[PDB]
Design an enzyme around this catalytic site. Structure first.
Site, PDB file in Angstrom:
ATOM      1  N   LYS A 212       0.848  -1.187   0.000  1.00 51.30           N
ATOM      2  CA  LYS A 212       0.000   0.000   0.000  1.00 51.30           C
ATOM      3  C   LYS A 212       0.887   1.241   0.000  1.00 51.30           C
ATOM      4  O   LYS A 212       1.716   1.424   0.893  1.00 51.30           O
ATOM      5  CB  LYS A 212      -0.922  -0.006   1.227  1.00 51.30           C
ATOM      6  CG  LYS A 212      -1.940  -1.146   1.227  1.00 51.30           C
ATOM      7  CD  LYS A 212      -2.704  -1.265   2.542  1.00 51.30           C
ATOM      8  CE  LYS A 212      -3.586  -0.045   2.839  1.00 51.30           C
ATOM      9  NZ  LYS A 212      -4.098  -0.068   4.265  1.00 51.30           N
TER      10      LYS A 212
ATOM     11  N   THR B  19     -10.348   3.648  -2.172  1.00 50.35           N
ATOM     12  CA  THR B  19     -10.742   4.635  -1.169  1.00 50.35           C
ATOM     13  C   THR B  19     -11.606   5.773  -1.699  1.00 50.35           C
ATOM     14  O   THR B  19     -11.178   6.538  -2.559  1.00 50.35           O
ATOM     15  CB  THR B  19      -9.519   5.182  -0.394  1.00 50.35           C
ATOM     16  OG1 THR B  19      -8.815   4.087   0.204  1.00 50.35           O
ATOM     17  CG2 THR B  19      -9.960   6.144   0.703  1.00 50.35           C
TER      18      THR B  19
END
Lengths: 504, 455, 510, 507
Positions: free
Chosen positions: D246, D304
């Site tokens: 990430k 997101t």
């Protein structure tokens, strides 16, 4: 470092040109078929064997001259020379036979040579009495209808367009002309009438017999002279008929009408010859390169064979080395996209037929490496119709794979030749080894860029997978023998199935 | 339906080829300079005038033969023929004079021959091995090549030095230097021309393997290049020549330096009034490759058809120029490009493709400004208006530049003097059939660009 | 190392993507026009002044709400705010006024009699729609009045009806002559005077109503710069707006709003007739499936770029900023992608009209547009624009394209363009230079309307005309140089390009 | 007419845009994987079943919250939901489980207190205030926050909506709002000295191995060594678990190339990223990372706030619709939902909308240029399997095939096909359940799990699996009898790769 691989990697054509490297050696394989006109200098069995060794793939017989008996003998010698290699099928090279028609030619009579001078008067007569009394005053020619199709002010060319006349007056049974470009005039010279619609038959009685004779002699292809339109092609096709249905018809484009009506001619034909000799007399010489590139592009686009012909190595008729313009011409025909290149007087009657053939092989191989495949393949992709045909998918798949793993050959098992033609149309760098049991397929395959035909002589094995393996292994032995690749290289194999195979 | 404009609009090069049209006539202007070798067939004042009218732009003098007095006379005759058209400035066509050096030749006379030694004689037609393998009729003082052998002759010999000097004396516009092998060869020639000849363009001739291998440094040092295919094609395999040709033209285009394609382009026209199909194609492909100039040797020097040869190069160049795929060429030049004058020139060229102008008129003293425009290879002709006579002649080296020599007095007000020179260009273009009233042309005044109607 | 120039040099789009650099800062200039809807949050002179400073270029008046008196006061405040900066001509920013028409809207009534009131709708509940004007201001949980008298003849049982930006969904379960009994498919809060969509229905309302005609005439009277015409379905709709503006409003820009399927289907004839286009995503994403909107958006922007007509991307671009001081990641993405698509302008609605963070929203559009403008792959875009451009006899087009080509070659700090009507500067903008286009004009309307086009930075010359032409030209050019230096577009010594109206000059900044 | 084929043929990108047609319907298959964060709203077996039906391919568990006990139950439920479909192998859809680590987070203590724009606040490390946070005192778990901080440094709380300006810290509210318990805290431009893999992460990772998870999403990866630390914990037992790094801070972007090299894939973690760096720069990082992953042939996830408003509403905003479509257009292998599925009121709608948008967007890709570029930028090799994969993709474009069927054991062969980004779905037949789950990380791979036992006769074995694929394709409307598909046979036991591509009509 070899095969112009550095230039091949360039991101622009300009950079591609900049990277062309005279020190970067080509691969062994030469993809461009070489067509040789046979005559006095190359008709003997012994010379023919050497021409095969030098690289001749197709023997062209020009039916503008010679009897059926003379040509049957030529054909016999070609086959003798060809079959003298048949004992080793690994190294045997198929050789095609092409019949080039007379077609709607116009010829002068018999003179001895006379000097035609600029400004002088010259009468054209049809009176048969002068048929063999041609001189600087009266010239007979065999086109009886000439007066009905030419006008005052129009031009007449004689002898490969070297002598030019202007029509000044139209007599009852004759034409009065004035010499513009003078020169020495021989006998039975070719005549051209730019701007005129010549009304001779597309297929004359003589053409009919010549075509029939071709069928009887089992020729592989016909080069049909002065094709003007699709219906001309259909007549040739009808004459070859059922017995000659598998004979390829190559339409010769040699006048303005053929160029104008090119698209319908191409659709009807199996291929095209850019017949620059006549074409560059019928239209201005400075425009021929435009027609050549147009026709080659459109043939490439359609996936049909195209031949570049005439005067490619002309000076070699009398000299052992070509001019720099000639070296350039052969290279550029190949770069343009030509499937085959041709030799006429250079092999038919010249003093260095073997050197002419060898020089075409040498130039073609260098030029083939210099092609910008990155762009060519991208464009062929884009311009190719998205269709459902699975063999078509396999073919492009194999070519793509061949660029990726930089394979030494694409091996194709083919009966009619079609499967292999489908691969050739995408223009792989790698040679296409077309394995066939059909002798005619093997010969005709020379029409297609990149196809190296090999003729399998083993009987058909009962087990399919064994029969496939036999043929692919044959192709492998040929590739190794000819130095196309070696043990441990990687080749693509098409049987619908594509396999990527290490060479044993 | 003219200038191959249908093919010009193709999305791919293949479709470009597919659209080339024998019935789409070219424009009148011809962009590629024609360089003619002068000799017995073309030496007279009378014939020279015809050669000018036929399209000759540069007179090449081969110092492999003839004396200074001979060459002086030829030079005199060229200038007489040329100036014979001076009475009408609108119709005068500058003509440049080129001196081509003998350089490190070998004639049937090489000293340490046996210390470097296949041997070729006479355009490599006759072959020899240390027995006559090839052959035929051998002649007098023919040229010899020793491929692979490191011939140690001087790049610039005594004869060469005196010839170059003579060049300066004679006010020649350019030198074609033979057998240039490296940057240091170029520097020797440059030194000889020295300060007095500092303005004389040096064109390096690449005629051997080392010239090719060391091409980049040679190009950096030179003002331009000649692809000297005659010797080159004996020194290396004949079948490799086209690779060298296209590499050199490509790299010259990339560098913005003049490149000449030379030798045997229309060879058969020495004895015949029409070229072969291979020769037609060679000239056309040289122009398509990107050659600034094409050349005639025997064809104009000694042949029976000098004028026909010049007219044929003219006809072919013009056809080929329209068949160039400018869309791709221009985009690639833009991308591969590394100054306001440069921005102005590229902008003019872009404009000229946009409005399909009849010309780009460039006012230039040194010629640099017009050179900068030519390097982006517009379709439209570049009419270079200069008051400098040498500039007018040397400008022929660049594709597309049609130089015109302004002889009007310098106006006091700058804008008026510009307008006078521009209208001179307008007049030349109308007279030559390049454009007509109402047409639009691009004007670069020297940093200004105007888009202007032809008055 | 600045302005994504390393990425600009890439040979492929893929490689262009790989080189995008968060540490490569943009230039100062921001090319994409920002349009702000005015309302309670942004109507004061104080706020308007700050919005201008934050980057507002166009004030949008939404005539779906408010009286003529209300809008006149808005326009008055906008101009007061705008002219407060007029004293320094070098720093003055022209600000345009856009009238956005009501058009053939369907609106609900007043919930409990209050503009501000709400009720909750629960999923699965029933809700009766009435046309009886008795319930105009008595809307609630069980009775919802709307103003589309002929709704019963256009809908059916099973028909879906959406209220309030398509958030409330209803299905018709039963008809009547005066009513419809519906089932709430998706509940939520139901406010007052909300917009109604009948995506399946063939609404019979005219493109230009009598109210629209009054509003348009009012626009002409008020001297607005442009009109955003709602629910344009065909070329004839555009012609009607054009006719209503008349001779007096002939110079007012007509921007067609594409908000239904028909507007998309007949897009080409709409564009031909229009001065420009708004991708009206709000209604559009109700009228057609929401997942198809990005297609309509990219098609319209592409075709507007191709035609050289301004296109506006609108609606919900930074929606969350109505309540929050920072946008969501999708919203940051949306703005950036609209600019990469080719949008001349971006727009804010609720974000500036009523939200709690109007200045932050304007600032965020400014920041994103600037980053994205550097991220454009100009190499391919310019190449394609050109390739797709007609060869024409027009000398101004040749000059414009030459200027843009040169501006890439010398990476200029600007293209200065002297223009009366703005057309000359529009011709430059259509080729999408990286360098900002400083359009010098004496014509105040031209200066305002210039904001419609990507990359045009209009400056208003207030100086008297000079008798000598070259002196008048020099005065206007020097004005441009002064603005450029003061805004930090470039500095002394930088090379800039000047179009004078046809001449192109490449000069150094004085 | 369909699948944007008209736009597909355009000679330029601009004309490609101009031809995009809202009336040109896409094919049935959706190539982009959908990752759903599982939480209170989506955790039940009943709801999980619907999630699968709506398009969920990967279940993500966020270990920033919840006990191992809680997560084991979620995992059990995912598997119950997933196996409830296993009776009919032809229609069974594999579902992967992804463990997303807490990593070097900084959070605040327990307390809501409205914070006021222009007000002092006490950042204290004094654990006495751990559960006594308020309008005046605020405790956070980053004990060494002082060596890394400085005067005038900024600090963000709760998705960076609250901002502050600087063995304790006194600060001012530069931006106010209500404050809850245990909110995320970011220190942009500061060097946070926390471990890439903390004691908790280690136990979470081991638990993940024990729970047989398919992949880990490793939070806050800054450098290649972070990745190695994660690989080490997973150890030999977890050697086949994919590590997705990430990228959530400036350092991760900076050192992206070395991270990508060490990883099995990448998540564009835009939440934290858009707080660590200016929000207006996030799209640059996203396109960079997606481009570079496409170039490397490794999976890239866009994450997101993609459909954020759907936490509360049944329909997305226009910017959200755009964001999803553009992530796909960018080249993202997978797209992700967080709050939208973990806790929102419309999890199923959110899944469905990602499915609809991805499918529309996949059709709108300009494959012509994309394939040209991937090729031209692709290192040529001797690798026969590479040659067969690119050959199959090219063939699939030429004949607009209904699918490319690939037989694969570990998935690698199918990945190779997917890296060339065919339009046609890649039906990856495998007998390995893990391969079938992990395959979802790759754009265009539709994994099918063959339950049949291996045949002795290889030709019989191939026919069996291939026919399985034919049956799957038909049942899911990917193609119909008489259509044409490409088949890659892959690995032959004891012989090796067949290196074979067949072009086959659908039976």
């Amino acid at each position: 470092q070899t095969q112009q691989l550095h230039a091949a990697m360039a991101d622009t054509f300009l950079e591609h040109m900049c990277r062309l490297d005279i020190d970067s050696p080509p691969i062994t394989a030469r993809n461009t078929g070489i067509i040789c006109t046979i005559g006095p200098a190359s008709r003997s069995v012994e010379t023919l064997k050497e021409m095969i060794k030098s690289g001749m793939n197709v023997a062209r017989l020009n039916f503008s001259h010679g009897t059926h008996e003379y040509h049957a003998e030529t054909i016999k010698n070609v086959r003798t020379a060809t079959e003298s290699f048949a004992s080793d099928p690994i190294l045997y090279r198929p050789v095609a036979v092409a019949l080039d028609t007379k077609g709607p030619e116009i010829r002068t009579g018999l003179i001895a040579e006379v000097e035609l001078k600029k400004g002088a008067t010259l009468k054209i007569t049809l009176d048969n009495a002068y048929m063999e009394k041609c001189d600087e005053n009266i010239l007979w020619l065999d086109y009886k209808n000439i007066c009905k199709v030419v006008e005052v002010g129009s031009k007449i060319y004689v002898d490969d367009g070297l002598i030019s006349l202007q029509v000044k007056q139209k007599g009852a049974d004759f034409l009065v002309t004035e010499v513009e470009n003078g020169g020495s005039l021989g006998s039975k010279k070719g005549v051209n009438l730019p701007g005129a619609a010549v009304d001779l038959p597309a297929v004359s009685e003589k053409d009919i017999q010549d075509l029939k004779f071709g069928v009887e002699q089992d020729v592989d292809m016909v080069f049909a002279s002065f094709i003007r339109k699709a219906s001309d092609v259909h007549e040739v096709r009808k004459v070859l008929g059922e017995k000659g249905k598998n004979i390829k018809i190559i339409s010769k484009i040699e006048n303005h009408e053929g160029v104008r009506r090119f698209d319908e001619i191409l659709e009807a034909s199996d291929g095209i010859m850019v017949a620059r000799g006549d074409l560059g007399i019928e239209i201005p010489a400075e425009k021929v390169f435009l027609a050549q590139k147009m026709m080659i592009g459109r043939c490439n686009r359609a996936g049909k064979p195209v031949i570049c012909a005439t005067q490619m190595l002309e000076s070699m008729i009398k000299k052992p080395r070509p001019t720099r313009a000639e070296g350039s011409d052969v290279a550029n025909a190949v770069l343009d996209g030509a499937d085959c290149i041709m030799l006429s007087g250079e092999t038919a009657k010249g003093d260095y037929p073997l050197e002419a053939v060898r020089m075409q092989h040498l130039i073609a191989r260098e030029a083939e490496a210099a092609i910008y495949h990155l762009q060519l393949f991208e464009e062929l992709r884009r311009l190719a119709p998205i269709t459902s045909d699975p063999t078509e998918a396999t073919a492009v798949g194999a070519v793509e794979a061949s660029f990726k793993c930089c394979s030494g050959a694409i091996i194709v098992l083919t009966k009619s030749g079609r499967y292999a033609h489908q691969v050739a149309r995408y223009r792989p760098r790698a040679p296409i080894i077309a394995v066939t049991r059909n002798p005619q397929t093997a010969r005709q395959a020379h029409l297609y860029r990149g196809i190296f035909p090999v003729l399998c002589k083993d009987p058909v094995q009962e087990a399919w997978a064994e029969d496939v393996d036999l043929r692919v292994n044959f192709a492998m032995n040929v590739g190794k023998a000819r130095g196309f690749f070696k043990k441990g290289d990687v080749v693509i194999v098409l049987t619908n199935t594509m396999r990527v195979v290490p060479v044993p």
